Subunit: 218 residues, 5 copies
Amino acid sequence: VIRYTLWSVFKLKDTLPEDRAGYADEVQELFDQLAAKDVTIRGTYDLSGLRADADLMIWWHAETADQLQEAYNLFRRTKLGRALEPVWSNMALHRPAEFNRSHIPAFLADETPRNYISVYPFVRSYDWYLLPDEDRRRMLADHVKMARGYPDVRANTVASFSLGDYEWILAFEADELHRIVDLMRHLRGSEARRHVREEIPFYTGRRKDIGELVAGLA
Amino acid sequence: DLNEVIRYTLWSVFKLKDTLPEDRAGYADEVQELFDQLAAKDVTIRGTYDLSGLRADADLMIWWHAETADQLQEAYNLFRRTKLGRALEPVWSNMALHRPAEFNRSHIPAFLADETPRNYISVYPFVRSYDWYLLPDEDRRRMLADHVKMARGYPDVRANTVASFSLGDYEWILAFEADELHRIVDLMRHLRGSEARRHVREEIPFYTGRRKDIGELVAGLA
Amino acid sequence: DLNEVIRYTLWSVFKLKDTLPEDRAGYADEVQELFDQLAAKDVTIRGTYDLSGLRADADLMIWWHAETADQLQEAYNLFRRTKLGRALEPVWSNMALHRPAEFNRSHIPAFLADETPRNYISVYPFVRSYDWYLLPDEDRRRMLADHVKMARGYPDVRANTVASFSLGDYEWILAFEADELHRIVDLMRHLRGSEARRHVREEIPFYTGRRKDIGELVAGLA
Amino acid sequence: KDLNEVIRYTLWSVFKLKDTLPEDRAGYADEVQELFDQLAAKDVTIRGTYDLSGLRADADLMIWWHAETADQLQEAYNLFRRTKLGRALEPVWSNMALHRPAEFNRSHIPAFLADETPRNYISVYPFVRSYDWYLLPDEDRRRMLADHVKMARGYPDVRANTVASFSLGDYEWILAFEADELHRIVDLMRHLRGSEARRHVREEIPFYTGRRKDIGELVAGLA
Amino acid sequence: EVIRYTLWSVFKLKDTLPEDRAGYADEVQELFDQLAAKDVTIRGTYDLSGLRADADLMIWWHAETADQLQEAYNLFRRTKLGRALEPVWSNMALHRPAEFNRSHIPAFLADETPRNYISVYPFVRSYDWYLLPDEDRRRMLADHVKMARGYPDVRANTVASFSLGDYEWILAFEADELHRIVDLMRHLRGSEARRHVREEIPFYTGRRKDIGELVAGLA
Ligand code: NA
């Protein structure tokens, strides 16, 4: 029913120490104690190279915003956290859909998280929500029909009104990176594209467990 | 009346330079002593709010109000001299002032009414379209009326709407309070169906967080 | 009297690097000493203003004017060498030049009419729409005249409208002065009803604060 | 036919000096050349290293590299950041793109994929089209893009690399133009302002324009 | 048919210069002399301080190739003065023949003398400006030149910069009286070409100074 989800992006302050021995195990220990507290770490992602101002993303969710705030601060006390600068951190809340109330975010359907993710915020035009419900229904229905040829890339569209600067946070997961690219380009032919004001920054990266992630960062 | 009282309100947003020390003993105590010293029947502290996690560039917000802007400036600088203030970077600090409404003159912001602050807050500046204030009065009145109607189902969400022309970059500062955070998001989504949404130029940044006494706030920050 | 006389105006905004030392002994004295020397060269400091709290990224403004831009540049650099100057970071510094008005050539900025500085200021730059200067002269005259008409309910708010084309990013710098801050807010709100509001492109950042002696200003900063 | 059917990711990574390189920088270029040699032994291609200094204030060096997976380029990026030169630099702008078949002319293959040799000057910039461009009748897009390559015909010495980047970053395409005469890029871009497709543009900044150099000469000439 | 690249490089102080700065201007002047022996011309150094919070110094230099100006820029950044500065904005342009009035070239290529004051800014036209019928553009540019004929003492430098940076043109106006640049710019707001502008910021305006005087005047 009520599930908050948070995507927290970090950049390296400079590089990690040449010997970073306890770094990944301290974080893994924290992740283990948070799961005990009903905070789910859906994934950590390597963003480096694909963005100059970002290296790491944590995707976590829980029943209250407050538990995600605590996890965020606990992570920052970590040795890895203390080597990182926060860049972008945005929360969303799963609410019922306007028209098709079967659409549940992948993370909420206990679906396996895929190898690649592309996360971006979203803001519609000023008049989108003022259109006749009939018009908003048709365009969203088209939106899912054209997506139907990409069932291998899983959608996570969550409301974020009033939690930050946006209206929705979107997160697409797929095991092949080029499938997110092709879907995104295909969805440019949707007529809902006439009703967009903002959809950046894009944070795109590779799911890794924390040991390998720490090892591959500069 | 209470529309002829002058009361300035300030929202001051800060970010940790890094993290607080492992040993932060007197940190929250020093700030509390400042607060009731400030409260010496003059500068009111409506709340301190934990914003961390909900945005990367902010960690705490102070909401204070007083009879003059000068008192709020002094309070601001005094806070920056505390140990906690010296661990923080200012991020966004905007002042506003209750001015009598154009139409419904008994909408008073909750803070000037002395109502109890709620668990969660969402504050953002607001700038209307260039011709909103040029519209026929009844057009504006109807849209604002349609807008009040669209909120009828959220009496639990308290709205502060306060004029800020020429005090900073904006026209209004808005602050919504509620005990359940999900009610603020639902109200916001619902209000997207209001006809006044066609007369908006700016409405960010959003600063949203959990009201906490300074003790637990200092303890939970990185 | 003199529209043909040349007077450059500069508003220089600074931000604390961190916090002033607790012993800030000769900080204000060095700056006052500098200001008295500048006055000897007919570089006049109209005011120093406390911006802190009303803005997170600014703490102090200096308003100075002189017969040449060169003299104001020299004063700025001299200020930056004082102890107080080395504790600040420049934020926004913008020059303007009095140029005779288009129609109401009897419009003189308050700083050129020997009006004494008021206790509060609100300073912002201004950029008109692209076609404003392309409208028939009479449509521009009417809008400028009506805007003058709406502003006569606020004779206690003194205007300083000065051209800045090609000295920086803007077309005008504006500075309003009043002994009561809430009257600047109300004027700005009232002028939103002016038809010229359909011909605006940019009017931020706003820098608003309290005029203060440099000694009291140095004392009250963090 | 298996030209656009392969998968080749390409990355342009831009860095700024933190301040200045040391006067004694004896091993700096050598370490990087070593890494580039090692990476070539991994099928990561360094198409070029470019000196961007002076042409903008916020950038000094660009690396253009491509490989079969995004992952390989991520690894290379981080390896470069560990070198002595990499540690004297600040990341500025790093964007990835992936060759996909063009909508109308599948005979448009980016120069680096047609394995043309790198020219002396490069101009790199991202691109975002208007909201309605992808909604237009397929005829209009066909016509305006045909209009576009026809006007580009007077500049065959300027080689084009237009690569899709949807959901890899903030943009829709990354473009890179290469020529041995910098002024020919300027004249091409000016001439292309007369194209009907210019009515369907939302973003095309930052431009990173610079001179291709061997890493030894690059390092010796940086401040 | 000549190729001349022109670069405007803007810097700001990291903090202030040392109270004792005896070798700073000398060293830079030596570099300028060494560059003159490679036909890299320094048209001027300009004091921007005070008119801009985030800029203190501009160098205007031009050479036959972009590469020479890169070398010069990096050489400057190695001087003691260069080490006390942060790069802010550095943009190159290239003189290309005009679409209509081929009789107009920038002042610096006509080798006339640099004036006391400069105002430099980039320029980007509307998307449809280059799409208008040639006669509409020709009329608007012609009338705009007519509006500027009352200011012969303000010298214009309009130089193409497509694909060298974020802009389409770099403009630089030189005059011995600063108020005449203000008045011309105000006057030209009544030109119909103002309907075809997308960007014209930042403005960097300052006072031409010899490097010795400029180093001594900076905070
Ligand atoms: Na990127």
